[PDB]
């Protein structure tokens, strides 16, 4: 067979140890999920330094905690805007997930609070920037470099899926690089805790699994499809399915055809054909052997999964870092005041925040 006795025994033991880890991790998650923390700071505890990101959600600012001197990323949401955009449930869900999970590649929420006008989530500052920026600048990542990041996503999805969380928001724009060169996953509004199927059309066109596009009920296998898109984009510099308009992207996604750069290794192409598999009965991550089909694939044969988890692998790329509060790996944005109305807005809607 493919493995001799020693290798087969070591792999078997490793897979059993994963099950043991995940069972404990689920116990820990469920305790925090059922008793969430709240109101752990206030706005005047922080100096606001610079805007690091913006979106329909609001903004993320670099802040400095006055008492400790520590820098953090503060996400600021306007309650009335969240209501207008029909994002109440997603916003509450993001905070509840963030305060309950614990994993080395998931960003840590350190404080949360609200005031008359806004909601605030204060997370560890991840100074290395978005993977997106580095990928577009470098052009493409080598297969070892892409593999280092991919392994972290595999472990993170193995953790999330064990908690019955479907992630649904994978893309380079949503992955940050920390000071040691490891990945931080930050966005959880569109994650959903369900054991079976769900039906919402959500995500980003290039990363949507066919079953989402086709308005089917779908499950956690959509995350393994999205991993295939991510690995492809990291290693090629462009995603597997693109076009001028989303409709044409969707036609390519559902077609069952994917083409590869000539520099892709055969091992990489084999992995990608099994992740970018339109037939759910054949997609890696969705079969009887679960995540093991991915972790044991030839493309990952050099990956030491425990060493990645322990953060003992030397990263292939270390972002520039001049000191705490360095913002050079993020873009520049126009600075807007943060206003706090003298009247509470939307109190009922956000009671649980």
């Amino acid at each position: 067979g493919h493995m001799g006795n020693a290798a087969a025994a070591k792999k078997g033991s490793e897979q059993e140890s994963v099950k043991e880890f995940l069972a404990k991790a689920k116990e820990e998650f469920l305790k925090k999920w059922e008793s969430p923390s709240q109101n752990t700071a206030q706005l005047d505890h922080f100096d606001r330094i610079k805007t690091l990101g913006t979106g329909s959600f609001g903004r993320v600012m670099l802040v400095k905690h006055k008492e400790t001197g520590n820098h953090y990323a503060m996400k600021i949401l306007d309650k009335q805007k969240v209501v207008k955009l029909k994002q109440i449930e997603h916003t509450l869900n993001e905070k509840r997930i963030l305060q309950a999970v614990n994993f080395p590649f998931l960003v840590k929420l350190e404080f949360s609070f609200k005031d008359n006008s806004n909601l605030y989530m204060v997370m560890e500052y991840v100074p290395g920037g978005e993977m997106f920026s580095h990928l577009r600048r470098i052009g493409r990542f080598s297969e070892p470099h892409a593999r280092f990041y991919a392994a972290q996503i595999v472990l993170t999805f193995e953790y999330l899926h064990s908690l019955d969380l479907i992630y649904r928001d994978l893309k380079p724009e949503n992955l940050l690089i920390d000071q040691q060169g490891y990945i931080q996953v930050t966005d959880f509004g569109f994650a959903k805790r369900v054991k079976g199927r769900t039906w919402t059309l959500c995500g980003t066109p290039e990363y949507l699994a066919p079953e989402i596009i086709l308005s089917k009920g779908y499950n956690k296998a959509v995350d393994w499809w999205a991993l295939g898109v991510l690995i492809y984009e990291m290693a090629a510099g462009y995603p597997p399915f693109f076009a001028d308009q989303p409709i044409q992207i969707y036609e390519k996604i559902v077609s069952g055809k994917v083409r590869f750069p000539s520099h892709f290794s055969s091992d990489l192409k084999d992995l990608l054909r099994n992740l970018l598999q339109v037939d759910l009965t054949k997609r890696f991550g969705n079969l009887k052997n679960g995540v093991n089909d991915i972790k044991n694939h030839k493309w990952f044969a050099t990956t030491d999964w425990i060493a990645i988890y322990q953060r003992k692998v030397e990263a292939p790329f270390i972002p520039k870092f001049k000191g705490p509060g360095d913002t050079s790996n993020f873009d520049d944005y126009e600075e807007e005041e943060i206003r706090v109305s003298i009247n509470e807005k939307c109190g009922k809607e956000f009671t649980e925040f």
């Binding site: 329909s56 997106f132 724009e173 959500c202 995500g203 066109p205 510099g237 462009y238 693109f242 076009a243």
Partner: peptide, 20 residues
């Protein structure tokens, strides 16, 4: 080339989710 086609798509910048 495929790279040129990617540039021509206009989708080389940060991509919005469907709801945005």
């Amino acid at each position: 080339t495929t790279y040129a086609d990617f540039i021509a798509s206009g989708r080389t910048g940060r991509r919005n989710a469907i709801h945005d």
